[PDB]
Design an enzyme around this catalytic site. Structure first.
Site, PDB file in Angstrom:
ATOM      1  N   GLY A   7      30.365 105.834 -15.955  1.00 24.42           N
ATOM      2  CA  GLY A   7      30.951 104.545 -14.969  1.00 24.42           C
ATOM      3  C   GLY A   7      32.232 104.151 -15.329  1.00 24.42           C
ATOM      4  O   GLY A   7      33.053 104.756 -16.124  1.00 24.42           O
TER       5      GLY A   7
ATOM      6  N   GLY B 294      34.147 106.844 -20.251  1.00 22.79           N
ATOM      7  CA  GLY B 294      32.666 106.750 -20.382  1.00 22.79           C
ATOM      8  C   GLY B 294      31.842 106.735 -19.118  1.00 22.79           C
ATOM      9  O   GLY B 294      32.469 106.614 -18.168  1.00 22.79           O
TER      10      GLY B 294
ATOM     11  N   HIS C 260      40.462 109.704 -13.782  1.00 17.07           N
ATOM     12  CA  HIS C 260      39.466 110.779 -13.696  1.00 17.07           C
ATOM     13  C   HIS C 260      38.207 110.420 -12.985  1.00 17.07           C
ATOM     14  O   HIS C 260      37.777 111.250 -12.034  1.00 17.07           O
ATOM     15  CB  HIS C 260      39.145 111.172 -15.172  1.00 17.07           C
ATOM     16  CG  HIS C 260      38.547 112.522 -15.240  1.00 17.07           C
ATOM     17  ND1 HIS C 260      37.150 112.396 -16.040  1.00 17.07           N
ATOM     18  CD2 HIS C 260      38.808 113.735 -15.157  1.00 17.07           C
ATOM     19  CE1 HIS C 260      36.632 113.763 -16.043  1.00 17.07           C
ATOM     20  NE2 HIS C 260      37.535 114.510 -15.637  1.00 17.07           N
ATOM     21  N   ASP C 261      37.724 109.333 -13.069  1.00 14.62           N
ATOM     22  CA  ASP C 261      36.687 108.887 -12.444  1.00 14.62           C
ATOM     23  C   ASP C 261      36.918 108.917 -11.020  1.00 14.62           C
ATOM     24  O   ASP C 261      35.930 109.387 -10.440  1.00 14.62           O
ATOM     25  CB  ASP C 261      36.377 107.275 -13.055  1.00 14.62           C
ATOM     26  CG  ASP C 261      35.548 107.143 -14.189  1.00 14.62           C
ATOM     27  OD1 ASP C 261      35.622 108.322 -14.928  1.00 14.62           O
ATOM     28  OD2 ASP C 261      35.102 106.205 -14.541  1.00 14.62           O
TER      29      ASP C 261
ATOM     30  N   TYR D 298      34.099 126.178 -14.118  1.00 15.09           N
ATOM     31  CA  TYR D 298      35.504 126.728 -13.339  1.00 15.09           C
ATOM     32  C   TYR D 298      36.242 127.869 -14.056  1.00 15.09           C
ATOM     33  O   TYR D 298      36.905 128.449 -13.601  1.00 15.09           O
ATOM     34  CB  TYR D 298      36.093 125.643 -12.879  1.00 15.09           C
ATOM     35  CG  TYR D 298      36.547 124.544 -13.927  1.00 15.09           C
ATOM     36  CD1 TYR D 298      37.179 124.850 -15.083  1.00 15.09           C
ATOM     37  CD2 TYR D 298      36.138 123.289 -13.842  1.00 15.09           C
ATOM     38  CE1 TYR D 298      37.376 123.892 -16.030  1.00 15.09           C
ATOM     39  CE2 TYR D 298      36.467 122.242 -14.703  1.00 15.09           C
ATOM     40  CZ  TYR D 298      37.025 122.647 -15.956  1.00 15.09           C
ATOM     41  OH  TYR D 298      37.350 121.621 -16.945  1.00 15.09           O
TER      42      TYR D 298
ATOM     43  N   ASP E 282      39.913 117.535 -14.416  1.00 13.77           N
ATOM     44  CA  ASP E 282      39.967 117.444 -15.986  1.00 13.77           C
ATOM     45  C   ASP E 282      41.456 117.872 -16.696  1.00 13.77           C
ATOM     46  O   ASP E 282      41.753 117.203 -17.518  1.00 13.77           O
ATOM     47  CB  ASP E 282      39.099 118.764 -16.427  1.00 13.77           C
ATOM     48  CG  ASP E 282      37.716 118.463 -16.129  1.00 13.77           C
ATOM     49  OD1 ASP E 282      36.655 119.106 -16.313  1.00 13.77           O
ATOM     50  OD2 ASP E 282      37.112 117.245 -15.328  1.00 13.77           O
TER      51      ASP E 282
ATOM     52  N   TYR F 124      37.014 102.605 -18.797  1.00 14.16           N
ATOM     53  CA  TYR F 124      36.647 103.761 -17.955  1.00 14.16           C
ATOM     54  C   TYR F 124      36.614 104.925 -18.785  1.00 14.16           C
ATOM     55  O   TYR F 124      36.245 105.990 -17.859  1.00 14.16           O
ATOM     56  CB  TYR F 124      37.911 104.001 -16.960  1.00 14.16           C
ATOM     57  CG  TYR F 124      37.790 102.952 -15.739  1.00 14.16           C
ATOM     58  CD1 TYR F 124      37.204 103.237 -14.649  1.00 14.16           C
ATOM     59  CD2 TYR F 124      38.241 101.600 -16.144  1.00 14.16           C
ATOM     60  CE1 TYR F 124      36.769 102.185 -13.689  1.00 14.16           C
ATOM     61  CE2 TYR F 124      37.995 100.542 -15.322  1.00 14.16           C
ATOM     62  CZ  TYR F 124      37.522 100.996 -13.917  1.00 14.16           C
ATOM     63  OH  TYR F 124      37.417  99.814 -12.859  1.00 14.16           O
TER      64      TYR F 124
ATOM     65  N   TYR G  59      36.760 112.259  -9.705  1.00 16.23           N
ATOM     66  CA  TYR G  59      35.429 112.864  -9.431  1.00 16.23           C
ATOM     67  C   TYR G  59      34.860 112.162  -8.226  1.00 16.23           C
ATOM     68  O   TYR G  59      33.639 112.856  -7.552  1.00 16.23           O
ATOM     69  CB  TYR G  59      34.589 112.687 -10.749  1.00 16.23           C
ATOM     70  CG  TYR G  59      34.853 113.844 -11.561  1.00 16.23           C
ATOM     71  CD1 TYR G  59      35.951 114.340 -12.025  1.00 16.23           C
ATOM     72  CD2 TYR G  59      33.525 114.305 -12.325  1.00 16.23           C
ATOM     73  CE1 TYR G  59      36.093 115.506 -12.974  1.00 16.23           C
ATOM     74  CE2 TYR G  59      33.722 115.639 -13.071  1.00 16.23           C
ATOM     75  CZ  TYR G  59      35.048 116.096 -13.383  1.00 16.23           C
ATOM     76  OH  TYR G  59      35.305 117.082 -14.329  1.00 16.23           O
TER      77      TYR G  59
HETATM   78  C1  LIG Z   1      31.854 111.185 -20.047  1.00 17.59           C
HETATM   79  O1  LIG Z   1      33.340 110.667 -20.699  1.00 17.59           O
HETATM   80  C2  LIG Z   1      34.104 111.581 -21.567  1.00 17.59           C
HETATM   81  C3  LIG Z   1      33.553 112.486 -22.149  1.00 17.59           C
HETATM   82  C4  LIG Z   1      33.961 113.179 -23.328  1.00 17.59           C
HETATM   83  O2  LIG Z   1      33.342 113.979 -24.012  1.00 17.59           O
HETATM   84  C5  LIG Z   1      35.269 113.103 -23.329  1.00 17.59           C
HETATM   85  C6  LIG Z   1      35.974 112.402 -22.550  1.00 17.59           C
HETATM   86  C7  LIG Z   1      35.415 111.538 -21.626  1.00 17.59           C
HETATM   87  O3  LIG Z   1      35.884 110.849 -21.187  1.00 17.59           O
HETATM   88 CA   LIG Z   2      34.209 106.806 -16.545  1.00 14.72          CA
HETATM   89 CA   LIG Z   3      30.841 127.359 -10.770  1.00 13.98          CA
END
Ligand SMILES: COC1=CC(=O)C=CC1=O
Ligand SMILES: [Ca+2]
Ligand SMILES: [Ca+2]
Ligand SMILES: COC1=CC(=O)C=CC1=O
Ligand SMILES: [Ca+2]
Lengths: 124, 124
Positions: A32, A30, A48-49, A73, A99, A28, A52
Site C-alpha cells: 500500500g 512497500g 508505481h503504486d 511478462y 516495473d 510508498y 498498478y
Molecule cells: C512490494 O514492494 C517492493 C518489493 C520489492 O521487492 C522491491 C521493491 C518494492 O517496491
Molecule cells: Ca506501495
Molecule cells: Ca502473463
C-alpha cells in the site's frame, strides 16, 4: 510479476538487493502507501503504486487474484538497460512498463538511509 | 504465448523451423482442427488444441482476446530440456505446460513428410 520487478531493479542497479533496499522505504515503497511521498525514491514507488492502480482499472485486463503482480511478462536486461518485449500482450506490456519505469526511477533517485523502515504512522 | 511455444519447439528439436515444420501438418497442427489425427505428431497437436480448450475453460483464467496464446509465461531451455518457471501464476503455468508437453511430444513423434499441408477437407 513481482519476481521479475525484483530482477529489473538488480538490472538497473547492479550493486543492489531489492527486497532489502526498497521494501518498507518511506511512505510508498512497500505494501500500500499513505500520505505524501518523503523522497524522489518514495515518489518512484508512489507512481508505481499508481501505475498498478491504472492497469487494475483497464476493462480489458483481468489479473489473477486481481493483482497485476501476478502477471509475468518477459523482459530482457543488457547492461543496465531494461527492455520490455514488444510481444507482451497489452496488459503484460502495461505491467512491464510500470516495473521498468520504476526500476529506471530507483536507479536515479537519491537513496536516503534515514527513510528505510520509516515510522509510517507518524510521517506518512 | 505463441512465440514462446515456437521457441520451446526449437529448444526440444534444435535442428528445426517450427512455423514451417508444424504449421498445417495433418489435421490438428494449425488453426483449429477436425476429424481424427493422422499421426503421433498430429495427435500431439490435437492434445495441445485440447489443452488450450481446458485452460480457456478454467473460471479463474480470463485470457486477453480469449486466446491462451496471448499469455506470456516465462520458461527456460537448457540443452533440450524445457523448464516452466514455478513462479508462473496458475493460468500461465497451465498454458506453459501445454506448450512444453507439446514440444516434448513433437520431439518424439515421427515426422512424415506426407502429411505436411494435408488436404484437410478430404482426410480430416
Ligand atoms: C512490494 O514492494 C517492493 C518489493 C520489492 O521487492 C522491491 C521493491 C518494492 O517496491
Ligand atoms: Ca506501495
Ligand atoms: Ca502473463
Ligand atoms: C498455430 O500452430 C502452430 C504454430 C507454430 O508456429 C508451431 C506449431 C504449431 O502447432
Ligand atoms: Ca490446432
Amino acid at each position: 510479476a513481482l519476481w521479475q520487478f525484483r530482477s529489473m531493479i538488480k538490472c538497473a542497479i547492479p550493486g543492489s538487493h531489492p527486497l532489502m533496499d526498497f521494501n518498507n522505504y518511506g511512505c510508498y515503497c512497500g505494501l500500500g502507501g499513505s500520505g505524501t511521498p518523503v523522497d524522489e525514491l518514495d515518489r518512484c514507488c508512489e507512481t508505481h503504486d499508481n501505475c498498478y492502480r491504472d492497469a487494475k482499472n483497464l476493462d480489458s485486463c483481468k489479473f489473477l487474484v486481481d493483482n497485476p503482480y501476478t502477471e509475468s511478462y518477459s523482459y530482457s536486461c543488457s547492461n543496465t538497460e531494461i527492455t520490455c518485449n514488444s510481444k507482451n500482450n497489452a496488459c503484460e506490456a502495461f505491467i512491464c512498463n510500470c516495473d521498468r519505469n520504476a526500476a529506471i526511477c530507483f536507479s536515479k533517485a537519491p537513496y536516503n538511509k534515514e527513510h528505510k523502515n520509516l515510522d509510517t504512522k507518524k510521517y506518512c
